[PDB]
Design a binder for this molecule. Structure first.
Ligand SMILES: CCCCCCCCCCCCCCCCCC(=O)OC[C@H](COP(=O)(O)OCCN)OC(=O)CCCCCCCCCCCCCCCCC
Ligand SMILES: CC(C)CCC[C@@H](C)[C@H]1CC[C@H]2[C@@H]3CC=C4C[C@@H](OC(=O)CCC(=O)O)CC[C@]4(C)[C@H]3CC[C@]12C
Ligand SMILES: CC(C)CCC[C@@H](C)[C@H]1CC[C@H]2[C@@H]3CC=C4C[C@@H](OC(=O)CCC(=O)O)CC[C@]4(C)[C@H]3CC[C@]12C
Ligand SMILES: CC(C)CCC[C@@H](C)[C@H]1CC[C@H]2[C@@H]3CC=C4C[C@@H](OC(=O)CCC(=O)O)CC[C@]4(C)[C@H]3CC[C@]12C
Ligand SMILES: CC(C)CCC[C@@H](C)[C@H]1CC[C@H]2[C@@H]3CC=C4C[C@@H](OC(=O)CCC(=O)O)CC[C@]4(C)[C@H]3CC[C@]12C
Ligand SMILES: CC(C)CCC[C@@H](C)[C@H]1CC[C@H]2[C@@H]3CC=C4C[C@@H](OC(=O)CCC(=O)O)CC[C@]4(C)[C@H]3CC[C@]12C
Ligand SMILES: CC(C)CCC[C@@H](C)[C@H]1CC[C@H]2[C@@H]3CC=C4C[C@@H](OC(=O)CCC(=O)O)CC[C@]4(C)[C@H]3CC[C@]12C
Ligand SMILES: CCCCCCCCOc1ccccc1C(=O)Nc1ccc(C(=O)OCC[N+](C)(CC)CC)cc1
Ligand SMILES: *[C@@H]1O[C@H](CO)[C@@H](O)[C@H](O)[C@H]1NC(C)=O
Ligand SMILES: *[C@@H]1O[C@H](CO)[C@@H](O)[C@H](O)[C@H]1NC(C)=O
Ligand SMILES: [Ca+2]
Ligand SMILES: [Ca+2]
Length: 1135
């Protein structure tokens, strides 16, 4: 119409979108200047100005809303409420108008104020790239519901188990004796807590409940030992972590299960439960880890990648001076370039030598060498423009880069006054990048990475917007509520706070890395309310398990002599090597000399070595060492066999040379380490492991270039970290550690001059610290030390240099990018192998696939006995009572069962317990009635043929068994121990399984998992073998590291120490999860107070190698497991 006409022109004018984006950005700026810790009710000039612009912004938003209203119409596809995002604009407009109106009525209620945060979310509409990305994301979300329902199953099952077992067990501490008589001066707490205000509680075990630690394990206090008086323990207090970790409700059990899904703080609560209830809850936690933290979030990744690929295809389917000549020959020689390459490489090596407490003369040689080098590059500069000319020089931009390098270098040389020596020193590292001009494959790899980054940019903006909105939300709801209680005269704010936008963004980034996020969860959820955990749940879920799976999908679909007896010999030797593994699993550093077991191990070693020598001799006489082709040593496995047997025999002869063992004990150590490597021939003696190792090594080469690039950035950032932090990683740990500036005052107060274990003194230490950072574990402490750094020999101060966030966060982002590139490279590499073999046999399967369709033609009607029950009193049962009409009632009763089992908690009222008993009775009645009606509906044939009514009968049988036993508790007919009653109550959870029949998508997804079990099973076997090797090796290396008060451990707390084989297998499992593994490796590399030679041994060289190798190998195996599942998923999708 005419009124629409005078306005519609501006609406589709792109300058309208431009000015809209300008006001959106101005609004984001105004939201970014919130200071909840200081902005108390807007009594400031800045607050007034910000409120004024907020009013102006609201005026403009209302104007644009109403104008697009009078230009599009209402309630129609073409109308204003046509886009999803226009409805959102409507919502912000109404919400802000309500907020303003309530401000008019003197009802502030800054809980409608927090709706501001959704205002930046309108910018998704005004960036068309963001519109497209978010549109595909939202259109692929609705197919994520299947894995969301699997998530619900694994949360509900484990939550019910937890609330049934450990409801209120977390609350019990060791209290004083009931009638405690004291002379006076009441100072004892009612119970025992080691650190002030329940920093680490002392959760006991009740009498009757066979826990582990039971109030007689209290460390005696060293006046009189007060801790011996804490005799009895009862279940009344607050429960740990400021009432945050418990199993009272089912909401709290969900919180704890979500904490162990993210693999953070897992072991601490595992030991909580072990102390409170029983030793055998590690089964619960291991199964929860394997099912949830590995087969849930990775199934989320698989489903999101596949669904995003499918959405990409779907929307795509809708569309479908004579020396100048002579001087050149030296230049383009392909050999002078190699000489200058050695020049640059030794320049890099020279830059790497520098370290802390560097000798006076060595650094002097370093500057001399730098001058020589830069003279060489300047000579190259002069030469290559003379024989070429200026324009020929400027043709290649690598020449521009080299010119910048040479000018920066020469400027740095002559700038020996100030400025140059401090920053142009940092620009020295750019000479390392010149190597890209020389490796041809690395040009191609970085070109591929730039091809990817063409599409990562829009995702980076979307992630930046997500982090901004969530940081502003955190500022609003967690502003100035994190203040730690006073310990030195004042309440210092927590480092992981929300007091300002910078700290909000860094803390949200930390949470997205899921490192120490549980600390922030506790500190914030105990401050506002227990419902505040929804903020972190929403943030972590949408970030890690939606947005990052989206990025992974973006990358993957942007890329896309005598006789021979050899019948049962291998199996007999396989049994023998298994027995060797069994006898390897006992060589703990605890059996005393001359033991009965020691003699057994020696004799077993002798016999096993003899048997393996016999095996080698038979193989070699069958083949010959290297006497011609197809000999013994022409396969890698056979070389490993010969190597192992030589190691064993040399170890035997050296052990028999024990007379005079001085200076050869190191040889003994090395040969014992190789004994621990020995249980490895299983790979050669098994087909599945051999093929899987071949597949691993085949899938490792293509990502070789990306691994090399990642190592190059590791070296570059290591040198940069050395430059930035030389001796700044020292701190004076003491009782005060306050009002002291430099270490001189530290020695005056005699506290200690402690040196952080993860520092940047050397370049090796820089590399170890950078690996710890890259593993996203313990990286927050390293970042804190970085920000605190001041200079060589004075105390670091809190947030001294907030500019190092750039270094420490850019490193994490770049390494994560390279790790995703490795993952996607592995996926596409496997995609080529699978696709080749797929087309042949699937076409061969399709020939037989249509035969099964012909088989269904036979299935038409084999005179089913539906009449046999007709007119036989089952006329209404077989047909009218077997359709979907009855299963909706049954699934409804199952849902009622679920919502009833979700009500038990600690100290539930007796009336609620009786109501639940009545509900359980009703559920038993309905299950029995359904089962009987089915049995009467059809004959006993399909009662077993269905493979499902069997499970239904099992559930009904357990339920009826349980209800009678609780009835036995009414008359007390026979005293039934509580164990069986509790077991059948907790087995009542099995009635959830009836939801599986209706969930066809769950069955399909879990099946698609199932036909991956060949590959997944062999990989799991190899993964367990990897644990076996590394566990034996860790027992031999680390078994003597004592863990006690004199040696304060950090990662090996109670059962994680490397003493025995199993107690080390547990800590290898924990390191595999990356939970405080950096703490474990800090524990291993530890100089002791001369109670052992190991602390003075070569541990510093070998423990980082041990842990780095283990973590990398474990992560690689898990990556390939996930890849195999993804491949079965895609292949199933194609058919
Ligand atoms: C070479 C350096 C590559 C940098 C990777 C270092 C790293 O960050 O490892 C930790 C990371 C665990 O990631 P997280 O967040 O804890 O789950 O683990 C990873 O994401 C890296 C896994 C990819 C494997 C790259 C190296 C493979 C070489 C070992 C092959 C062993 C074959 C047997
Ligand atoms: C992944 C889903 C489909 C199945 C999960 C199975 C667990 C919920 C069950 C199976 C083994 C059960 C555990 C078997 C052993 C014990 C020891 C028992 O300790 C004593 O009572 C003594 C406490 C129950 C518990 C932890 C059970 C807890 C519940 C567990 C972990
Ligand atoms: C889409 C949902 C699932 C995640 C998006 C996050 C927010 C929309 C939700 C999740 C967490 C919720 C918060 C959970 C805890 C709190 C603390 C709670 O604090 C108080 O009660 C203080 C007393 C008062 O203010 O009257 C107020 C509700 C609030 C802000 C909730 C506001 C709405 C939040 C931020
Ligand atoms: C791969 C290239 C580009 C990087 C440089 C090689 C470094 C990995 C190696 C070679 C020289 C080694 C350094 C040689 C000398 C020392 C001094 C030493 O400290 C002493 O004072 C003795 C500590 C080890 C360190 C820094 C070594 C750390 C590891 C370094 C830097
Ligand atoms: C001289 C005495 C008093 C101290 C011994 C020095 C060690 C503390 C330093 C010197 C060399 C350093 C090593 C230099 C090289 C590395 C490789 C590094 O491997 C990596 O993580 C980088 C490869 C990658 O992750 O991509 C592991 C740390 C390590 C073994 C360093 C461990 C610590 C070492 C042994
Ligand atoms: C089938 C193979 C491939 C894997 C199974 C081997 C291990 C899982 C088993 C076999 C040997 C067992 C170990 C045998 C010896 C020890 C030392 C043993 O220590 C004691 O007897 C002292 C305990 C005390 O003093 O109370 C504790 C069990 C433990 C760790 C066992 C842990 C579990 C082990 C390693
Ligand atoms: C594949 C990994 C991640 C899970 C395998 C779990 C179990 C096979 C491991 C982990 C915990 C270990 C237990 C940790 C504690 C002890 C007590 C200790 O002896 C007392 C040594 C045996 C045992 C049962 C260990 C046996 C081997 C266990 C059960
Ligand atoms: C220079 C351009 C930068 C472009 C941005 C790149 C985003 C960088 O990635 C982050 C950026 C900011 C904050 C956190 C992260 C991060 O890495 N999150 C996070 C992801 C996965 C997990 C996890 O366990 O799944 C395991 C998944 N793999 C593959 C195993 C299967 C191992 C990764 C935990 C945590
Ligand atoms: C530390 O220095 C401050 C500065 O005046 C002083 O007040 C205080 O007494 C000193 N000692 C301690 C333990 O704080
Ligand atoms: C160490 O700190 C004290 C305290 O201000 C200062 O007086 C002194 O100059 C500093 N440097 C030293 C002792 O080398
Ligand atoms: Ca972690
Ligand atoms: Ca951690």
């Amino acid at each position: 119409t005419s009124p629409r006409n005078w306005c519609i022109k501006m609406v589709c004018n792109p300058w309208f979108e431009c000015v809209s984006m300008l006001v959106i950005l101005l609004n984001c700026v105004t939201l970014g200047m919130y200071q909840p810790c200081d902005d108390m009710d807007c009594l400031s000039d800045r607050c007034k100005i910000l409120q004024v612009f907020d009013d102006f912004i609201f005026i403009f938003f209302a104007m644009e809303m109403v104008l697009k209203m009078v230009a599009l119409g209402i309630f129609g596809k073409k109308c204003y409420l046509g886009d999803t995002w226009n409805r959102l604009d409507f919502f912000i407009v109404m919400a802000g108008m309500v907020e303003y109106s309530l401000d008019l009525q003197n009802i502030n209620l800054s809980a409608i104020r927090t709706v501001r945060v959704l205002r930046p979310l309108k910018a998704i509409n005004r960036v068309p790239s963001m519109r497209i990305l978010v549109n595909l994301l939202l259109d692929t979300l609705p197919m994520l519901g299947n894995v969301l329902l699997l998530c619900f199953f694994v949360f509900f099952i484990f939550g019910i188990i937890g609330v049934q077992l450990w409801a209120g067990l977390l609350r019990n501490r060791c209290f004083l004796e009931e009638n405690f008589t004291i002379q006076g001066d009441v100072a004892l707490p009612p119970y025992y807590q080691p650190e002030e205000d329940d920093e680490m509680p002392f959760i006991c075990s009740l009498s009757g409940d066979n826990g582990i630690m039971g109030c007689h394990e209290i460390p005696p206090l060293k006046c009189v030992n007060w801790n011996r008086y804490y005799n009895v323990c009862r279940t009344g207090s607050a429960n740990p972590h400021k009432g945050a970790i418990n199993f009272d409700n089912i909401g709290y059990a969900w919180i704890v299960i979500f904490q162990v899904i993210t693999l953070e703080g897992w072991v601490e609560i595992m030991y909580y439960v072990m102390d409170a209830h029983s030793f055998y809850n590690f089964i619960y936690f291991i199964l929860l880890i394997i099912v949830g933290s590995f087969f849930m979030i990775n199934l989320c990744l698989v489903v999101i990648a596949t669904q995003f690929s499918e959405t990409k295809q779907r929307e795509h389917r809708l569309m479908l001076r004579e020396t100048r000549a002579k001087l050149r020959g030296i230049v383009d020689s392909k050999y002078f370039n190699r000489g200058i390459m050695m020049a640059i490489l030794v320049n890099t090596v020279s830059m790497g030598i520098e370290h802390h407490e560097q000798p006076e003369e060595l650094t002097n040689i370093l500057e001399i060498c730098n001058v020589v080098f830069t003279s060489m590059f300047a000579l190259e500069m002069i030469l290559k423009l003379a024989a070429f000319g200026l324009f020929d020089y400027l043709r290649n931009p690598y020449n521009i880069f080299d010119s910048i390098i040479v000018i920066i270098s020469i400027w740095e040389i002559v700038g020996q006054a100030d400025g140059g020596l401090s920053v142009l020193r940092t620009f020295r590292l750019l000479r390392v990048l010149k190597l890209v001009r020389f490796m041809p494959a690395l040009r191609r790899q970085l070109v591929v990475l730039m091809k990817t980054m063409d599409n990562v940019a829009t995702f980076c903006m979307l992630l930046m917007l997500f982090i901004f909105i969530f940081s502003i939300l955190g500022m609003h709801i967690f502003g100035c509520k994190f203040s730690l209680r006073t310990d030195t005269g004042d309440t210092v704010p927590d480092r992981k706070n929300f007091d300002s936008l910078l700290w909000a963004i860094v803390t949200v980034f930390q949470i997205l890395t899921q490192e120490d996020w549980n600390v922030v969860l506790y500190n914030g959820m105990a401050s506002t309310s227990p419902w505040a955990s929804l903020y972190f749940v929403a943030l972590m879920t949408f970030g890690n398990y939606v947005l990052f799976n989206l990025l992974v999908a973006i990358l993957v679909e942007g890329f896309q002599q005598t006789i021979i007896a050899h019948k049962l010999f291998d199996y007999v030797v396989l049994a023998f090597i298994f027995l060797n593994c069994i006898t390897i699993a006992l060589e703990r550093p605890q059996i005393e000399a001359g033991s009965t077991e020691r003699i057994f191990l020696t004799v077993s070693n002798y016999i096993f070595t003899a048997i393996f020598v016999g095996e080698m001799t038979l193989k070699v006489v069958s083949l010959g060492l290297y006497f011609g082709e197809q000999a013994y040593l022409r396969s890698s496995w056979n070389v490993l066999d010969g190597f192992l047997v030589f190691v064993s025999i040399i170890d035997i002869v050296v052990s028999l040379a024990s007379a005079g063992g001085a200076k050869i004990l190191g040889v003994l150590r090395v040969l014992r380490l190789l004994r621990t490597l020995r249980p490895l021939r299983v790979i050669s003696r098994a087909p599945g492991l051999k093929l899987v190792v071949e597949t691993l090594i085949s899938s490792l080469k293509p990502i070789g270039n990306i691994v090399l690039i990642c190592c190059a950035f590791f070296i570059i950032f290591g040198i940069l970290g050395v430059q930035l932090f030389k001796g700044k990683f020292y701190h004076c740990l003491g009782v005060d550690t306050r009002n002291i500036t430099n270490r001189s005052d530290c020695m005056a107060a005699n506290y200690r001059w402690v040196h952080h274990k993860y520092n940047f003194d050397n370049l090796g230490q820089a590399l170890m610290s950078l690996f710890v950072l890259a593993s996203k574990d313990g990286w927050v402490n390293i970042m804190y030390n970085g920000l605190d750094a001041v200079a060589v020999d004075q105390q670091p101060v809190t947030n001294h240099n907030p500019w190092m966030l750039l270094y420490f966060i850019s490193f994490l982002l770049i390494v994560s990018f390279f790790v995703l590139n490795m993952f996607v490279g592995v996926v596409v590499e496997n995609f080529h192998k699978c696709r080749q073999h797929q087309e042949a046999e699937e076409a061969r399967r399709r020939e037989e696939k249509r035969l099964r369709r012909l088989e269904k033609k036979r299935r038409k009607a084999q005179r089913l006995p539906y009449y046999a029950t007709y007119c036989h009193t089952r006329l209404l049962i077989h047909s009218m009572c077997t359709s979907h009409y009855l299963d909706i009632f049954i699934t409804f009763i199952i849902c009622l069962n679920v919502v009833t089992m979700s009500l038990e908690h600690y100290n539930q009222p007796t009336s609620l317990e009786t109501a639940l008993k009545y509900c359980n009775y009703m559920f038993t009645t309905v299950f029995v009635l359904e089962a009987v009606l089915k049995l009467v509906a059809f004959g006993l044939r399909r009662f077993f043929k269905d493979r499902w009514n069997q499970l239904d009968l099992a559930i009904v049988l357990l339920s009826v068994m349980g209800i009678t036993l609780e009835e036995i508790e009414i008359n007390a007919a026979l005293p039934i121990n509580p164990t069986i009653i509790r077991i059948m109550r907790v087995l009542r959870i099995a009635r959830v399984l009836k939801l599986l029949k209706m969930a066809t998508g769950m069955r399909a997804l879990l099946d698609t998992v199932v036909q991956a079990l060949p590959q997944v099973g062999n990989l799991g076997l190899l993964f367990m073998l990897l644990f076996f090797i590394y566990a034996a090796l860790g027992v031999e290396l680390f078994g003597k590291l004592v863990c006690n008060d004199e040696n304060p451990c950090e990662g090996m707390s109670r059962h994680a120490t490397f003493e025995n084989f199993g107690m080390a297998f547990l800590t290898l499992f924990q390191v595999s999860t990356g939970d405080n593994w950096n703490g474990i490796m800090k524990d291993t590399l530890r100089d002791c107070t001369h109670d052992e030679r190991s602390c003075l041994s070569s541990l510093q060289f070998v423990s980082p190698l041990y842990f780095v190798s283990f973590v990398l190998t474990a992560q690689f195996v898990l990556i390939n497991v996930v890849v195999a599942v993804l491949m079965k998923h895609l292949d199933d999708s194609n058919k």
